[PDB]
Amino acid sequence: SPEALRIGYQKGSIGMVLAKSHQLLEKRYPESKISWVEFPAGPQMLEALNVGSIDLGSTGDIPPIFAQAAGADLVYVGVEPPKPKAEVILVAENSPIKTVADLKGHKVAFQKGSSSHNLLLRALRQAGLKFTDIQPTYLTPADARAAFQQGNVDAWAIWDPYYSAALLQGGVRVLKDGTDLNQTGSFYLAARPYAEKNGAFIQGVLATFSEADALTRSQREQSIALLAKTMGLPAPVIASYLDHRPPTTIKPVNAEVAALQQQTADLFYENRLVPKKVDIRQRIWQPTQLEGKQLEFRVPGNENLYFQ
């Protein structure tokens, strides 16, 4: 284990947040200085990873494409399953819009460059539409939430927990979720030299986050109370939020996931969202457990006296 592990996490990095709350890493690795740094979103976290002020971070599938397209050598060390039920396009319940095709000509709010921008490009494409076929309305979630409530847009593409919060307030309906959109999953990233130097350690760390995520099922009451506090949201919103997640696993990134991530990188480059095509497979860490090298010798001679 290394001298220190500085972890970048977000409020929705469930494995990380539960591991932190339960002090699992501090207890498992008493010889490492474990530290936790909360970021407001993936891009800011990856900036920190890239200047070297943190060693391991959790983000969705989109932020890493931006960083890597800019030349960051950050590697994918682990992937979690996608959450198709947690990523949605919402309309008002009694909206005459019944399918994604019905969005043609309408105003749709979402954050530019976000997981919702990706969902929306893909959903529209299924229905034989492009962004030139609607009025894309680029807004961050607080600004979008207001516009949607005021009937200034007809649909809002957004992620959880905003989704669950809007849902419980009533009046809204999921027009489309990520289910048939073959989503990729969320990722854990590190700098390549740290991953290569600390292979066994990282694997154990990730395995710890996966154990911690499982507490949301085995200790649901306690975990809901924790996340209501840390996220600052009502317990029923957290309950809905957990109900939209599949069982979490953290695994090495396989060929299939790599190909899905490559598809998204291509989509983003094709739409000039990033300036470069990226070779996603070059950024996949093949797990290793490299033993550190030590230079050690012995001078035998007279009887060994243990200590004089």
UniProtKB/Swiss-Prot annotation:
Keywords on record: Periplasm, Signal, Transport
Chief place where the protein resides: periplasm
One Gene Ontology term from the biological process aspect of the record: sulfur compound metabolic process
Cell compartments where the protein resides: Periplasm
CDD domains: PBP2_SsuA (cd13557)
Entry-linked Pfam families: NMT1 (PF09084)
GO molecular function, one term: ABC-type alkanesulfonate transporter transporter activity
The name this protein goes by in its record: Putative aliphatic sulfonates-binding protein
Source organism: Escherichia coli (strain K12)
